[PDB]
Amino acid sequence: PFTIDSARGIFPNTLAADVVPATIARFSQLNAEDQLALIWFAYLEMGKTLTIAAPGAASMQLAENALKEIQAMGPLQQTQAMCDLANRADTPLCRTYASWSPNIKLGFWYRLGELMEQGFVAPIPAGYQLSANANAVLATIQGLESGQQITVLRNAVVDMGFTAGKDGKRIAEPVVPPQDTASRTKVSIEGVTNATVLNYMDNLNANDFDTLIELFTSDGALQPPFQRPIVGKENVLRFFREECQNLKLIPERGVTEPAEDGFTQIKVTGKVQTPWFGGNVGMNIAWRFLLNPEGKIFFVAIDLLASPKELLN
Numbered sequence: 001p002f003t004i005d006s007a008r009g010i011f012p013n014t015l016a017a018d019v020v021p022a023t024i025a026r027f028s029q030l031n032a033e034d035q036l037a038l039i040w041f042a043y044l045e046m047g048k049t050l051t052i053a054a055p056g057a058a059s060m061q062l063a064e065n066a067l068k069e070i071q072a073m074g075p076l077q078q079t080q081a082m083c084d085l086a087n088r089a090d091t092p093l094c095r096t097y098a099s100w101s102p103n104i105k106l107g108f109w110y111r112l113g114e115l116m117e118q119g120f121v122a123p124i125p126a127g128y129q130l131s132a133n134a135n136a137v138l139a140t141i142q143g144l145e146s147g148q149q150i151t152v153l154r155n156a157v158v159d160m161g162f163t164a165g166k167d168g169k170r171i172a173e174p175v176v177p178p179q180d181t182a183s184r185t186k187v188s189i190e191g192v193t194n195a196t197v198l199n200y201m202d203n204l205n206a207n208d209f210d211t212l213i214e215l216f217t218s219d220g221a222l223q224p225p226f227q228r229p230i231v232g233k234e235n236v237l238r239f240f241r242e243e244c245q246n247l248k249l250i251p252e253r254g255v256t257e258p259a260e261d262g263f264t265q266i267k268v269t270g271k272v273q274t275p276w277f278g279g280n281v282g283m284n285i286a287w288r289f290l291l292n293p294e295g296k297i298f299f300v301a302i303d304l305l306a307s308p309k310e311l312l313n
């Protein structure tokens with residue numbers, strides 16, 4: 001019989017970029033000031049080649065009050081507020097931050113980065129030198145492909161703050177209207193004509209989450225890169241609406257195999273673009289589907305791949 005935990009094992013020879021969670025683990029060991037300085041350095045150097053897209057208007061409005069609070073602080077208090085976030089200390093600011101969706105957290109830091117560059121928010125101390133462990137962490141990051149680099153940064157950002165309780169309030173950007181069916185493009189996948197997989201891709205590309213979720217079984221799950229499975233339609237739909245808007249999925253090739261009891265397992269490789277970087281960063285991605293006899297999604301995993309040589313053939 002199939003369980004979510006066991007389905008995690010399909011296509012086991014897929015080599016995921018586990019250097020990413022490895023690096024985040026090392027990063028999380030560092031002193032808070034080194035964490036902030038390390039990301040500042042990474043951000044400035046990346047900025048020479050890649051431009052981050054501007055945060056959406058709604059996002060900025062939601063982070064506005066927190067941002068102004070920090071801006072009104074004296075420089076030492078500003079540095080303390082940022083250290084609190086990095087240390088995951090329990091403060092009202094850290095609790096507010098923890099209630100934000102990833103995009104709102106990212107836009108928050110986007111704006112603080114501008115202000116630090118402009119000198120209106122306490123910057124990293126001049127001539128600051130990273131610790132021994134911190135220097136090696138940054139070196140690892142700069143050795144990564146851009147897709148892995150931005151994933152490390154995002155995970156660092158999402159990890160900050162303080163979560164008290166599970167059913168604490170959740171704040172996310174408004175859900176965008178699905179793309180009008182007329183202007184929708186359709187993907188083509190070498191080797192794969194499976195309607196569920198193609199509909200999965202096309203609806204996500206159209207931000208049509210209501211149609212997308214109907215592809216799943218009631219107890220079905222979605223496993224984002226380096227995260228635990230998100231289980232059930234309620235939780236998966238929430239994830240779509242809060243975190244999966246305006247993606248571009250560009251699947252390339254796949255393979256289709258039988259599984260136990262009339263199930264089918266399908267692996268697809270290709271690229272994904274995040275709206276934070278548009279076409280300037282193409283992440284190498286595998287999708288691993290487990291479909292039931294009716295073609296419903298019992299499980300789909302999304303893996304960030306170790307390197308372009310992990311793409312099928």
Ligand SMILES: CC1=C(/C=C/C(C)=C/C=C/C(C)=C/C=C/C=C(C)/C=C/C=C(C)/C=C/C2=C(C)C(=O)CCC2(C)C)C(C)(C)CCC1=O
Binds near residue numbers: 113116153157224285
């Ligand atoms: C923090 C910080 C700073 C600021 C730093 C800043 C501003 C950093 C900002 C960094 C940014 C903007 C990072 C964004 C990354 C986005 C990624 C990895 C998205 C991937 C999505 C994927 C793979 C989607 C996959 C998907 C597909 C395909 C599905 O099929 C299902 C959906 C799913 C979602 C799973 C300063 C510079 C000020 C220094 C101080 C300091 O600490």
